[PDB]
PDB file of all heavy atoms in Angstrom:
ATOM      1  N   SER A  44     -10.330  21.462 -26.134  1.00  0.00           N
ATOM      2  CA  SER A  44      -9.239  20.564 -25.841  1.00  0.00           C
ATOM      3  C   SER A  44      -9.267  19.976 -24.408  1.00  0.00           C
ATOM      4  O   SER A  44      -9.009  18.744 -24.334  1.00  0.00           O
ATOM      5  CB  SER A  44      -7.886  21.394 -26.040  1.00  0.00           C
ATOM      6  OG  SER A  44      -6.785  20.403 -26.051  1.00  0.00           O
ATOM      7  N   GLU A  45      -9.596  20.762 -23.486  1.00  0.00           N
ATOM      8  CA  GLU A  45      -9.829  20.226 -22.083  1.00  0.00           C
ATOM      9  C   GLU A  45     -10.962  19.171 -22.196  1.00  0.00           C
ATOM     10  O   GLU A  45     -10.770  18.075 -21.563  1.00  0.00           O
ATOM     11  CB  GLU A  45     -10.153  21.344 -21.112  1.00  0.00           C
ATOM     12  CG  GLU A  45      -9.007  22.261 -20.831  1.00  0.00           C
ATOM     13  CD  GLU A  45      -9.240  23.019 -19.528  1.00  0.00           C
ATOM     14  OE1 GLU A  45     -10.134  22.681 -18.754  1.00  0.00           O
ATOM     15  OE2 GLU A  45      -8.507  23.953 -19.284  1.00  0.00           O
ATOM     16  N   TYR A  46     -11.981  19.485 -22.889  1.00  0.00           N
ATOM     17  CA  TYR A  46     -13.163  18.568 -22.988  1.00  0.00           C
ATOM     18  C   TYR A  46     -12.645  17.233 -23.463  1.00  0.00           C
ATOM     19  O   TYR A  46     -13.019  16.159 -22.908  1.00  0.00           O
ATOM     20  CB  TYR A  46     -14.150  19.119 -23.976  1.00  0.00           C
ATOM     21  CG  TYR A  46     -15.325  18.241 -24.355  1.00  0.00           C
ATOM     22  CD1 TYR A  46     -16.512  18.440 -23.574  1.00  0.00           C
ATOM     23  CD2 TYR A  46     -15.278  17.271 -25.229  1.00  0.00           C
ATOM     24  CE1 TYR A  46     -17.629  17.605 -23.829  1.00  0.00           C
ATOM     25  CE2 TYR A  46     -16.369  16.476 -25.472  1.00  0.00           C
ATOM     26  CZ  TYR A  46     -17.543  16.671 -24.811  1.00  0.00           C
ATOM     27  OH  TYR A  46     -18.637  15.867 -25.030  1.00  0.00           O
ATOM     28  N   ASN A  47     -11.812  17.183 -24.515  1.00  0.00           N
ATOM     29  CA  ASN A  47     -11.296  15.904 -25.017  1.00  0.00           C
ATOM     30  C   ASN A  47     -10.403  15.228 -23.974  1.00  0.00           C
ATOM     31  O   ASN A  47     -10.476  13.985 -23.800  1.00  0.00           O
ATOM     32  CB  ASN A  47     -10.525  16.096 -26.347  1.00  0.00           C
ATOM     33  CG  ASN A  47     -11.454  16.412 -27.442  1.00  0.00           C
ATOM     34  OD1 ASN A  47     -12.559  15.940 -27.551  1.00  0.00           O
ATOM     35  ND2 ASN A  47     -10.920  17.266 -28.409  1.00  0.00           N
ATOM     36  N   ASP A  48      -9.617  15.956 -23.250  1.00  0.00           N
ATOM     37  CA  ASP A  48      -8.773  15.378 -22.202  1.00  0.00           C
ATOM     38  C   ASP A  48      -9.739  14.891 -21.051  1.00  0.00           C
ATOM     39  O   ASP A  48      -9.398  13.771 -20.496  1.00  0.00           O
ATOM     40  CB  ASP A  48      -7.787  16.355 -21.700  1.00  0.00           C
ATOM     41  CG  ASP A  48      -6.657  16.677 -22.761  1.00  0.00           C
ATOM     42  OD1 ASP A  48      -6.413  15.914 -23.628  1.00  0.00           O
ATOM     43  OD2 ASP A  48      -6.035  17.808 -22.600  1.00  0.00           O
ATOM     44  N   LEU A  49     -10.715  15.639 -20.689  1.00  0.00           N
ATOM     45  CA  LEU A  49     -11.620  15.184 -19.597  1.00  0.00           C
ATOM     46  C   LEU A  49     -12.274  13.850 -20.086  1.00  0.00           C
ATOM     47  O   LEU A  49     -12.379  12.854 -19.315  1.00  0.00           O
ATOM     48  CB  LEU A  49     -12.706  16.232 -19.375  1.00  0.00           C
ATOM     49  CG  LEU A  49     -12.420  17.158 -18.127  1.00  0.00           C
ATOM     50  CD1 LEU A  49     -11.422  16.590 -17.188  1.00  0.00           C
ATOM     51  CD2 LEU A  49     -12.032  18.519 -18.671  1.00  0.00           C
ATOM     52  N   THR A  50     -12.672  13.743 -21.335  1.00  0.00           N
ATOM     53  CA  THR A  50     -13.297  12.497 -21.802  1.00  0.00           C
ATOM     54  C   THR A  50     -12.405  11.370 -21.659  1.00  0.00           C
ATOM     55  O   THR A  50     -12.773  10.279 -21.259  1.00  0.00           O
ATOM     56  CB  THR A  50     -13.745  12.711 -23.247  1.00  0.00           C
ATOM     57  OG1 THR A  50     -14.768  13.691 -23.308  1.00  0.00           O
ATOM     58  CG2 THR A  50     -14.304  11.369 -23.859  1.00  0.00           C
ATOM     59  N   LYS A  51     -11.084  11.471 -21.988  1.00  0.00           N
ATOM     60  CA  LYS A  51     -10.131  10.373 -21.857  1.00  0.00           C
ATOM     61  C   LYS A  51      -9.972  10.060 -20.399  1.00  0.00           C
ATOM     62  O   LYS A  51     -10.049   8.865 -19.939  1.00  0.00           O
ATOM     63  CB  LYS A  51      -8.865  10.747 -22.571  1.00  0.00           C
ATOM     64  CG  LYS A  51      -8.201   9.694 -23.357  1.00  0.00           C
ATOM     65  CD  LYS A  51      -7.189  10.267 -24.381  1.00  0.00           C
ATOM     66  CE  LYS A  51      -7.909  11.029 -25.476  1.00  0.00           C
ATOM     67  NZ  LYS A  51      -6.990  11.641 -26.476  1.00  0.00           N
ATOM     68  N   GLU A  52      -9.641  11.095 -19.618  1.00  0.00           N
ATOM     69  CA  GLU A  52      -9.317  10.870 -18.178  1.00  0.00           C
ATOM     70  C   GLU A  52     -10.402  10.243 -17.440  1.00  0.00           C
ATOM     71  O   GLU A  52     -10.230   9.485 -16.532  1.00  0.00           O
ATOM     72  CB  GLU A  52      -8.958  12.217 -17.525  1.00  0.00           C
ATOM     73  CG  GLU A  52      -7.590  12.825 -17.917  1.00  0.00           C
ATOM     74  CD  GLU A  52      -7.402  14.144 -17.357  1.00  0.00           C
ATOM     75  OE1 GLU A  52      -8.150  15.080 -17.578  1.00  0.00           O
ATOM     76  OE2 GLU A  52      -6.363  14.295 -16.617  1.00  0.00           O
ATOM     77  N   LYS A  53     -11.684  10.594 -17.800  1.00  0.00           N
ATOM     78  CA  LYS A  53     -12.812   9.922 -17.217  1.00  0.00           C
ATOM     79  C   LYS A  53     -12.882   8.499 -17.542  1.00  0.00           C
ATOM     80  O   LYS A  53     -13.039   7.539 -16.725  1.00  0.00           O
ATOM     81  CB  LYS A  53     -14.117  10.590 -17.574  1.00  0.00           C
ATOM     82  CG  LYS A  53     -15.348  10.096 -16.802  1.00  0.00           C
ATOM     83  CD  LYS A  53     -16.643  10.400 -17.581  1.00  0.00           C
ATOM     84  CE  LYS A  53     -17.124   9.241 -18.479  1.00  0.00           C
ATOM     85  NZ  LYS A  53     -18.375   9.547 -19.055  1.00  0.00           N
ATOM     86  N   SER A  54     -12.703   8.178 -18.873  1.00  0.00           N
ATOM     87  CA  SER A  54     -12.646   6.826 -19.339  1.00  0.00           C
ATOM     88  C   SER A  54     -11.420   6.032 -18.748  1.00  0.00           C
ATOM     89  O   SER A  54     -11.601   4.859 -18.474  1.00  0.00           O
ATOM     90  CB  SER A  54     -12.545   6.789 -20.912  1.00  0.00           C
ATOM     91  OG  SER A  54     -13.291   5.679 -21.443  1.00  0.00           O
ATOM     92  N   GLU A  55     -10.402   6.776 -18.476  1.00  0.00           N
ATOM     93  CA  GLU A  55      -9.219   6.219 -17.801  1.00  0.00           C
ATOM     94  C   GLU A  55      -9.602   5.702 -16.396  1.00  0.00           C
ATOM     95  O   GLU A  55      -9.415   4.556 -15.975  1.00  0.00           O
ATOM     96  CB  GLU A  55      -8.129   7.316 -17.680  1.00  0.00           C
ATOM     97  CG  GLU A  55      -6.708   6.754 -18.030  1.00  0.00           C
ATOM     98  CD  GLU A  55      -6.385   6.818 -19.511  1.00  0.00           C
ATOM     99  OE1 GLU A  55      -7.252   7.283 -20.247  1.00  0.00           O
ATOM    100  OE2 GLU A  55      -5.284   6.296 -19.890  1.00  0.00           O
ATOM    101  N   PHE A  56     -10.224   6.622 -15.607  1.00  0.00           N
ATOM    102  CA  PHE A  56     -10.500   6.314 -14.188  1.00  0.00           C
ATOM    103  C   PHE A  56     -11.598   5.248 -14.119  1.00  0.00           C
ATOM    104  O   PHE A  56     -11.639   4.521 -13.125  1.00  0.00           O
ATOM    105  CB  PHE A  56     -10.914   7.568 -13.503  1.00  0.00           C
ATOM    106  CG  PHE A  56      -9.801   8.593 -13.318  1.00  0.00           C
ATOM    107  CD1 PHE A  56     -10.084   9.896 -12.975  1.00  0.00           C
ATOM    108  CD2 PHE A  56      -8.486   8.225 -13.320  1.00  0.00           C
ATOM    109  CE1 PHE A  56      -9.108  10.877 -12.760  1.00  0.00           C
ATOM    110  CE2 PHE A  56      -7.453   9.107 -13.115  1.00  0.00           C
ATOM    111  CZ  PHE A  56      -7.770  10.403 -12.828  1.00  0.00           C
ATOM    112  N   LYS A  57     -12.534   5.198 -15.004  1.00  0.00           N
ATOM    113  CA  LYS A  57     -13.647   4.199 -14.950  1.00  0.00           C
ATOM    114  C   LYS A  57     -13.178   2.825 -15.103  1.00  0.00           C
ATOM    115  O   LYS A  57     -13.556   1.957 -14.368  1.00  0.00           O
ATOM    116  CB  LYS A  57     -14.701   4.592 -15.999  1.00  0.00           C
ATOM    117  CG  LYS A  57     -15.919   3.568 -16.003  1.00  0.00           C
ATOM    118  CD  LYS A  57     -16.766   3.589 -17.217  1.00  0.00           C
ATOM    119  CE  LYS A  57     -17.651   4.799 -17.300  1.00  0.00           C
ATOM    120  NZ  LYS A  57     -18.469   4.924 -18.564  1.00  0.00           N
ATOM    121  N   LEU A  58     -12.167   2.593 -16.042  1.00  0.00           N
ATOM    122  CA  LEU A  58     -11.664   1.315 -16.224  1.00  0.00           C
ATOM    123  C   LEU A  58     -10.615   0.882 -15.163  1.00  0.00           C
ATOM    124  O   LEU A  58     -10.535  -0.247 -14.711  1.00  0.00           O
ATOM    125  CB  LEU A  58     -10.954   1.171 -17.554  1.00  0.00           C
ATOM    126  CG  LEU A  58     -11.275  -0.016 -18.339  1.00  0.00           C
ATOM    127  CD1 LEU A  58     -12.800  -0.243 -18.397  1.00  0.00           C
ATOM    128  CD2 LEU A  58     -10.765   0.006 -19.810  1.00  0.00           C
ATOM    129  N   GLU A  59      -9.871   1.831 -14.617  1.00  0.00           N
ATOM    130  CA  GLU A  59      -9.022   1.577 -13.520  1.00  0.00           C
ATOM    131  C   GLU A  59      -9.694   1.332 -12.225  1.00  0.00           C
ATOM    132  O   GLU A  59      -9.371   0.552 -11.330  1.00  0.00           O
ATOM    133  CB  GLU A  59      -8.030   2.791 -13.358  1.00  0.00           C
ATOM    134  CG  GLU A  59      -7.070   2.769 -12.162  1.00  0.00           C
ATOM    135  CD  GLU A  59      -6.031   3.807 -12.229  1.00  0.00           C
ATOM    136  OE1 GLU A  59      -6.272   4.958 -12.346  1.00  0.00           O
ATOM    137  OE2 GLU A  59      -4.781   3.320 -12.352  1.00  0.00           O
ATOM    138  N   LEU A  60     -10.857   2.116 -11.910  1.00  0.00           N
ATOM    139  CA  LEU A  60     -11.761   1.849 -10.834  1.00  0.00           C
ATOM    140  C   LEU A  60     -12.323   0.410 -10.796  1.00  0.00           C
ATOM    141  O   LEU A  60     -12.519  -0.094  -9.820  1.00  0.00           O
ATOM    142  CB  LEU A  60     -12.837   2.866 -10.782  1.00  0.00           C
ATOM    143  CG  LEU A  60     -13.628   2.853  -9.420  1.00  0.00           C
ATOM    144  CD1 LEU A  60     -12.742   3.397  -8.289  1.00  0.00           C
ATOM    145  CD2 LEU A  60     -14.907   3.778  -9.563  1.00  0.00           C
ATOM    146  N   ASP A  61     -12.658  -0.052 -12.025  1.00  0.00           N
ATOM    147  CA  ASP A  61     -13.078  -1.498 -12.170  1.00  0.00           C
ATOM    148  C   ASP A  61     -12.065  -2.464 -11.844  1.00  0.00           C
ATOM    149  O   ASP A  61     -12.336  -3.504 -11.294  1.00  0.00           O
ATOM    150  CB  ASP A  61     -13.581  -1.634 -13.626  1.00  0.00           C
ATOM    151  CG  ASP A  61     -14.724  -0.695 -14.012  1.00  0.00           C
ATOM    152  OD1 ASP A  61     -15.262   0.043 -13.188  1.00  0.00           O
ATOM    153  OD2 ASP A  61     -15.016  -0.681 -15.235  1.00  0.00           O
ATOM    154  N   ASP A  62     -10.858  -2.122 -11.963  1.00  0.00           N
ATOM    155  CA  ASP A  62      -9.691  -3.052 -11.603  1.00  0.00           C
ATOM    156  C   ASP A  62      -9.479  -3.078 -10.042  1.00  0.00           C
ATOM    157  O   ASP A  62      -9.431  -4.144  -9.514  1.00  0.00           O
ATOM    158  CB  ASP A  62      -8.427  -2.676 -12.276  1.00  0.00           C
ATOM    159  CG  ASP A  62      -8.159  -3.504 -13.499  1.00  0.00           C
ATOM    160  OD1 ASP A  62      -7.714  -4.611 -13.425  1.00  0.00           O
ATOM    161  OD2 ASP A  62      -8.378  -2.974 -14.600  1.00  0.00           O
ATOM    162  N   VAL A  63      -9.358  -1.893  -9.481  1.00  0.00           N
ATOM    163  CA  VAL A  63      -9.132  -1.754  -8.020  1.00  0.00           C
ATOM    164  C   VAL A  63     -10.336  -2.308  -7.294  1.00  0.00           C
ATOM    165  O   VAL A  63     -10.200  -3.002  -6.225  1.00  0.00           O
ATOM    166  CB  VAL A  63      -8.745  -0.346  -7.618  1.00  0.00           C
ATOM    167  CG1 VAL A  63      -9.756   0.299  -6.737  1.00  0.00           C
ATOM    168  CG2 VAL A  63      -7.401  -0.320  -6.924  1.00  0.00           C
ATOM    169  N   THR A  64     -11.515  -2.103  -7.839  1.00  0.00           N
ATOM    170  CA  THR A  64     -12.748  -2.590  -7.113  1.00  0.00           C
ATOM    171  C   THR A  64     -12.856  -4.110  -7.205  1.00  0.00           C
ATOM    172  O   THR A  64     -13.319  -4.755  -6.314  1.00  0.00           O
ATOM    173  CB  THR A  64     -13.938  -1.884  -7.629  1.00  0.00           C
ATOM    174  OG1 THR A  64     -14.971  -2.023  -6.637  1.00  0.00           O
ATOM    175  CG2 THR A  64     -14.498  -2.625  -8.903  1.00  0.00           C
ATOM    176  N   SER A  65     -12.277  -4.745  -8.328  1.00  0.00           N
ATOM    177  CA  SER A  65     -12.381  -6.139  -8.425  1.00  0.00           C
ATOM    178  C   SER A  65     -11.352  -6.867  -7.583  1.00  0.00           C
ATOM    179  O   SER A  65     -11.627  -7.845  -7.003  1.00  0.00           O
ATOM    180  CB  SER A  65     -12.286  -6.566  -9.909  1.00  0.00           C
ATOM    181  OG  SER A  65     -12.627  -7.948 -10.075  1.00  0.00           O
ATOM    182  N   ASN A  66     -10.068  -6.294  -7.565  1.00  0.00           N
ATOM    183  CA  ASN A  66      -9.084  -6.741  -6.639  1.00  0.00           C
ATOM    184  C   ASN A  66      -9.558  -6.714  -5.209  1.00  0.00           C
ATOM    185  O   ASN A  66      -9.434  -7.632  -4.429  1.00  0.00           O
ATOM    186  CB  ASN A  66      -7.779  -5.961  -6.819  1.00  0.00           C
ATOM    187  CG  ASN A  66      -6.898  -6.526  -7.934  1.00  0.00           C
ATOM    188  OD1 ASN A  66      -6.722  -5.836  -8.958  1.00  0.00           O
ATOM    189  ND2 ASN A  66      -6.383  -7.669  -7.679  1.00  0.00           N
ATOM    190  N   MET A  67     -10.043  -5.545  -4.822  1.00  0.00           N
ATOM    191  CA  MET A  67     -10.524  -5.387  -3.363  1.00  0.00           C
ATOM    192  C   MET A  67     -11.541  -6.403  -3.024  1.00  0.00           C
ATOM    193  O   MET A  67     -11.516  -6.977  -1.867  1.00  0.00           O
ATOM    194  CB  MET A  67     -11.133  -3.952  -3.184  1.00  0.00           C
ATOM    195  CG  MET A  67     -11.395  -3.552  -1.806  1.00  0.00           C
ATOM    196  SD  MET A  67      -9.879  -3.064  -0.939  1.00  0.00           S
ATOM    197  CE  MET A  67     -10.295  -3.182   0.839  1.00  0.00           C
ATOM    198  N   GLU A  68     -12.406  -6.864  -3.905  1.00  0.00           N
ATOM    199  CA  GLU A  68     -13.347  -7.885  -3.618  1.00  0.00           C
ATOM    200  C   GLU A  68     -12.723  -9.216  -3.310  1.00  0.00           C
ATOM    201  O   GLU A  68     -13.043  -9.888  -2.372  1.00  0.00           O
ATOM    202  CB  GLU A  68     -14.429  -7.998  -4.746  1.00  0.00           C
ATOM    203  CG  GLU A  68     -15.247  -6.767  -4.910  1.00  0.00           C
ATOM    204  CD  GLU A  68     -16.311  -6.870  -6.027  1.00  0.00           C
ATOM    205  OE1 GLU A  68     -16.472  -8.038  -6.612  1.00  0.00           O
ATOM    206  OE2 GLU A  68     -16.715  -5.800  -6.529  1.00  0.00           O
ATOM    207  N   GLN A  69     -11.803  -9.567  -4.165  1.00  0.00           N
ATOM    208  CA  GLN A  69     -11.101 -10.846  -4.006  1.00  0.00           C
ATOM    209  C   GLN A  69     -10.084 -10.874  -2.834  1.00  0.00           C
ATOM    210  O   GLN A  69      -9.996 -11.933  -2.132  1.00  0.00           O
ATOM    211  CB  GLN A  69     -10.315 -11.192  -5.281  1.00  0.00           C
ATOM    212  CG  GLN A  69     -11.176 -11.038  -6.559  1.00  0.00           C
ATOM    213  CD  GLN A  69     -10.396 -10.654  -7.767  1.00  0.00           C
ATOM    214  OE1 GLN A  69      -9.176 -10.526  -7.656  1.00  0.00           O
ATOM    215  NE2 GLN A  69     -11.020 -10.378  -8.919  1.00  0.00           N
ATOM    216  N   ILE A  70      -9.477  -9.784  -2.557  1.00  0.00           N
ATOM    217  CA  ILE A  70      -8.561  -9.777  -1.405  1.00  0.00           C
ATOM    218  C   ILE A  70      -9.322  -9.773  -0.070  1.00  0.00           C
ATOM    219  O   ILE A  70      -8.892 -10.460   0.927  1.00  0.00           O
ATOM    220  CB  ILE A  70      -7.685  -8.501  -1.531  1.00  0.00           C
ATOM    221  CG1 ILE A  70      -6.721  -8.566  -2.717  1.00  0.00           C
ATOM    222  CG2 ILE A  70      -6.847  -8.340  -0.248  1.00  0.00           C
ATOM    223  CD1 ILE A  70      -5.713  -7.428  -2.832  1.00  0.00           C
ATOM    224  N   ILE A  71     -10.448  -9.165  -0.029  1.00  0.00           N
ATOM    225  CA  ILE A  71     -11.348  -9.206   1.172  1.00  0.00           C
ATOM    226  C   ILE A  71     -11.900 -10.619   1.303  1.00  0.00           C
ATOM    227  O   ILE A  71     -11.810 -11.148   2.463  1.00  0.00           O
ATOM    228  CB  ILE A  71     -12.382  -8.143   1.037  1.00  0.00           C
ATOM    229  CG1 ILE A  71     -11.817  -6.710   1.455  1.00  0.00           C
ATOM    230  CG2 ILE A  71     -13.605  -8.516   1.940  1.00  0.00           C
ATOM    231  CD1 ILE A  71     -12.890  -5.669   1.640  1.00  0.00           C
ATOM    232  N   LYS A  72     -12.461 -11.231   0.305  1.00  0.00           N
ATOM    233  CA  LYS A  72     -13.033 -12.560   0.427  1.00  0.00           C
ATOM    234  C   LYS A  72     -11.953 -13.597   0.768  1.00  0.00           C
ATOM    235  O   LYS A  72     -12.166 -14.485   1.531  1.00  0.00           O
ATOM    236  CB  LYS A  72     -13.781 -12.937  -0.859  1.00  0.00           C
ATOM    237  CG  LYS A  72     -13.494 -14.316  -1.451  1.00  0.00           C
ATOM    238  CD  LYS A  72     -12.419 -14.184  -2.547  1.00  0.00           C
ATOM    239  CE  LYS A  72     -11.971 -15.549  -3.056  1.00  0.00           C
ATOM    240  NZ  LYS A  72     -11.482 -16.524  -2.052  1.00  0.00           N
ATOM    241  N   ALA A  73     -10.764 -13.442   0.258  1.00  0.00           N
ATOM    242  CA  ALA A  73      -9.689 -14.279   0.626  1.00  0.00           C
ATOM    243  C   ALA A  73      -9.218 -14.087   2.043  1.00  0.00           C
ATOM    244  O   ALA A  73      -8.966 -15.101   2.770  1.00  0.00           O
ATOM    245  CB  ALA A  73      -8.428 -14.035  -0.340  1.00  0.00           C
ATOM    246  N   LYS A  74      -9.150 -12.863   2.476  1.00  0.00           N
ATOM    247  CA  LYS A  74      -8.813 -12.542   3.843  1.00  0.00           C
ATOM    248  C   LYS A  74      -9.773 -13.188   4.854  1.00  0.00           C
ATOM    249  O   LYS A  74      -9.427 -13.666   5.939  1.00  0.00           O
ATOM    250  CB  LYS A  74      -8.719 -11.081   4.043  1.00  0.00           C
ATOM    251  CG  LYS A  74      -8.934 -10.489   5.481  1.00  0.00           C
ATOM    252  CD  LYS A  74      -7.771  -9.461   5.876  1.00  0.00           C
ATOM    253  CE  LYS A  74      -8.345  -8.305   6.638  1.00  0.00           C
ATOM    254  NZ  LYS A  74      -9.639  -8.576   7.404  1.00  0.00           N
ATOM    255  N   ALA A  75     -11.068 -13.247   4.459  1.00  0.00           N
ATOM    256  CA  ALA A  75     -12.080 -13.906   5.346  1.00  0.00           C
ATOM    257  C   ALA A  75     -11.828 -15.373   5.376  1.00  0.00           C
ATOM    258  O   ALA A  75     -11.902 -16.030   6.532  1.00  0.00           O
ATOM    259  CB  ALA A  75     -13.452 -13.594   4.838  1.00  0.00           C
ATOM    260  N   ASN A  76     -11.570 -16.048   4.285  1.00  0.00           N
ATOM    261  CA  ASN A  76     -11.283 -17.471   4.268  1.00  0.00           C
ATOM    262  C   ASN A  76      -9.985 -17.848   5.082  1.00  0.00           C
ATOM    263  O   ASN A  76      -9.789 -18.946   5.690  1.00  0.00           O
ATOM    264  CB  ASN A  76     -11.217 -18.077   2.934  1.00  0.00           C
ATOM    265  CG  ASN A  76     -10.878 -19.539   2.853  1.00  0.00           C
ATOM    266  OD1 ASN A  76     -11.260 -20.378   3.678  1.00  0.00           O
ATOM    267  ND2 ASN A  76      -9.942 -19.886   1.860  1.00  0.00           N
ATOM    268  N   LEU A  77      -9.019 -16.813   5.063  1.00  0.00           N
ATOM    269  CA  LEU A  77      -7.817 -16.986   5.873  1.00  0.00           C
ATOM    270  C   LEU A  77      -8.039 -16.787   7.376  1.00  0.00           C
ATOM    271  O   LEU A  77      -7.407 -17.467   8.152  1.00  0.00           O
ATOM    272  CB  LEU A  77      -6.787 -15.996   5.375  1.00  0.00           C
ATOM    273  CG  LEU A  77      -5.649 -16.423   4.420  1.00  0.00           C
ATOM    274  CD1 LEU A  77      -5.085 -15.230   3.706  1.00  0.00           C
ATOM    275  CD2 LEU A  77      -4.562 -17.298   5.045  1.00  0.00           C
ATOM    276  N   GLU A  78      -8.928 -15.838   7.775  1.00  0.00           N
ATOM    277  CA  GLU A  78      -9.200 -15.643   9.131  1.00  0.00           C
ATOM    278  C   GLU A  78      -9.844 -16.978   9.694  1.00  0.00           C
ATOM    279  O   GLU A  78      -9.471 -17.386  10.796  1.00  0.00           O
ATOM    280  CB  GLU A  78     -10.153 -14.524   9.339  1.00  0.00           C
ATOM    281  CG  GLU A  78      -9.509 -13.144   9.201  1.00  0.00           C
ATOM    282  CD  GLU A  78     -10.513 -11.957   9.049  1.00  0.00           C
ATOM    283  OE1 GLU A  78     -11.733 -12.166   8.793  1.00  0.00           O
ATOM    284  OE2 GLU A  78     -10.072 -10.807   9.153  1.00  0.00           O
ATOM    285  N   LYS A  79     -10.591 -17.635   8.901  1.00  0.00           N
ATOM    286  CA  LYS A  79     -11.226 -18.930   9.254  1.00  0.00           C
ATOM    287  C   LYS A  79     -10.205 -19.940   9.374  1.00  0.00           C
ATOM    288  O   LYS A  79     -10.127 -20.688  10.431  1.00  0.00           O
ATOM    289  CB  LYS A  79     -12.303 -19.295   8.305  1.00  0.00           C
ATOM    290  CG  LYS A  79     -13.602 -18.487   8.415  1.00  0.00           C
ATOM    291  CD  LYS A  79     -14.448 -18.661   7.209  1.00  0.00           C
ATOM    292  CE  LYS A  79     -15.749 -17.713   7.246  1.00  0.00           C
ATOM    293  NZ  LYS A  79     -15.343 -16.280   7.325  1.00  0.00           N
ATOM    294  N   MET A  80      -9.294 -20.159   8.330  1.00  0.00           N
ATOM    295  CA  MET A  80      -8.266 -21.188   8.335  1.00  0.00           C
ATOM    296  C   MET A  80      -7.232 -20.991   9.510  1.00  0.00           C
ATOM    297  O   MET A  80      -6.810 -21.932  10.143  1.00  0.00           O
ATOM    298  CB  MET A  80      -7.593 -21.196   7.029  1.00  0.00           C
ATOM    299  CG  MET A  80      -7.253 -22.636   6.524  1.00  0.00           C
ATOM    300  SD  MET A  80      -7.259 -22.688   4.734  1.00  0.00           S
ATOM    301  CE  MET A  80      -6.270 -21.274   4.287  1.00  0.00           C
ATOM    302  N   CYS A  81      -6.871 -19.747   9.743  1.00  0.00           N
ATOM    303  CA  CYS A  81      -6.107 -19.373  10.889  1.00  0.00           C
ATOM    304  C   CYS A  81      -6.653 -19.842  12.193  1.00  0.00           C
ATOM    305  O   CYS A  81      -5.969 -20.474  13.002  1.00  0.00           O
ATOM    306  CB  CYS A  81      -5.870 -17.864  10.819  1.00  0.00           C
ATOM    307  SG  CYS A  81      -4.899 -17.117  12.114  1.00  0.00           S
ATOM    308  N   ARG A  82      -7.985 -19.671  12.318  1.00  0.00           N
ATOM    309  CA  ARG A  82      -8.684 -20.038  13.583  1.00  0.00           C
ATOM    310  C   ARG A  82      -8.691 -21.544  13.659  1.00  0.00           C
ATOM    311  O   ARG A  82      -8.544 -22.100  14.779  1.00  0.00           O
ATOM    312  CB  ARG A  82     -10.018 -19.363  13.660  1.00  0.00           C
ATOM    313  CG  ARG A  82     -10.814 -19.728  14.909  1.00  0.00           C
ATOM    314  CD  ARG A  82     -10.045 -19.465  16.153  1.00  0.00           C
ATOM    315  NE  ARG A  82      -9.399 -18.169  16.164  1.00  0.00           N
ATOM    316  CZ  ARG A  82      -9.964 -16.958  16.397  1.00  0.00           C
ATOM    317  NH1 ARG A  82     -11.259 -16.991  16.796  1.00  0.00           N
ATOM    318  NH2 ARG A  82      -9.238 -15.858  16.331  1.00  0.00           N
ATOM    319  N   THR A  83      -9.001 -22.224  12.578  1.00  0.00           N
ATOM    320  CA  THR A  83      -9.019 -23.668  12.604  1.00  0.00           C
ATOM    321  C   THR A  83      -7.665 -24.186  12.953  1.00  0.00           C
ATOM    322  O   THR A  83      -7.450 -25.257  13.671  1.00  0.00           O
ATOM    323  CB  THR A  83      -9.511 -24.221  11.216  1.00  0.00           C
ATOM    324  OG1 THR A  83     -10.786 -23.799  10.846  1.00  0.00           O
ATOM    325  CG2 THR A  83      -9.459 -25.813  11.197  1.00  0.00           C
ATOM    326  N   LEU A  84      -6.561 -23.554  12.444  1.00  0.00           N
ATOM    327  CA  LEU A  84      -5.237 -24.012  12.843  1.00  0.00           C
ATOM    328  C   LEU A  84      -4.941 -23.810  14.263  1.00  0.00           C
ATOM    329  O   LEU A  84      -4.350 -24.597  14.947  1.00  0.00           O
ATOM    330  CB  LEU A  84      -4.203 -23.297  11.862  1.00  0.00           C
ATOM    331  CG  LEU A  84      -4.239 -23.804  10.439  1.00  0.00           C
ATOM    332  CD1 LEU A  84      -3.249 -22.933   9.620  1.00  0.00           C
ATOM    333  CD2 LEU A  84      -3.972 -25.278  10.199  1.00  0.00           C
ATOM    334  N   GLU A  85      -5.378 -22.650  14.741  1.00  0.00           N
ATOM    335  CA  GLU A  85      -5.123 -22.303  16.174  1.00  0.00           C
ATOM    336  C   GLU A  85      -5.814 -23.278  17.099  1.00  0.00           C
ATOM    337  O   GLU A  85      -5.237 -23.795  18.071  1.00  0.00           O
ATOM    338  CB  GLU A  85      -5.535 -20.864  16.461  1.00  0.00           C
ATOM    339  CG  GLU A  85      -5.585 -20.449  17.951  1.00  0.00           C
ATOM    340  CD  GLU A  85      -5.937 -19.009  18.174  1.00  0.00           C
ATOM    341  OE1 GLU A  85      -5.673 -18.185  17.244  1.00  0.00           O
ATOM    342  OE2 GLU A  85      -6.445 -18.603  19.182  1.00  0.00           O
TER     343      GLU A  85
END
């Protein structure tokens, strides 16, 4: 029974890690384009 719960929880974290890792990539790349635009405005 734990085995089945572990199998789910692992599949849970794998798909959720794909979400947070994809957001982190876009927020970082956006922050870089904003640092540039900020500097151009300054």
Side-chain angles (χ1 to χ4, degrees):
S44 189
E45 291 199 12
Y46 177 98
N47 288 327
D48 291 337
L49 265 339
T50 294
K51 222 160 295 181
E52 289 175 302
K53 189 201 96 177
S54 220
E55 225 85 4
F56 292 161
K57 183 194 284 174
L58 226 49
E59 173 168 62
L60 190 69
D61 304 350
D62 262 281
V63 114
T64 204
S65 193
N66 274 113
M67 192 77 200
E68 296 177 18
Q69 309 148 4
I70 294 184
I71 281 190
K72 131 263 179 302
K74 156 132 139 26
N76 176 42
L77 262 160
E78 288 164 348
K79 290 163 183 58
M80 218 148 52
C81 182
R82 179 53 45 82
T83 301
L84 291 175
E85 172 176 330

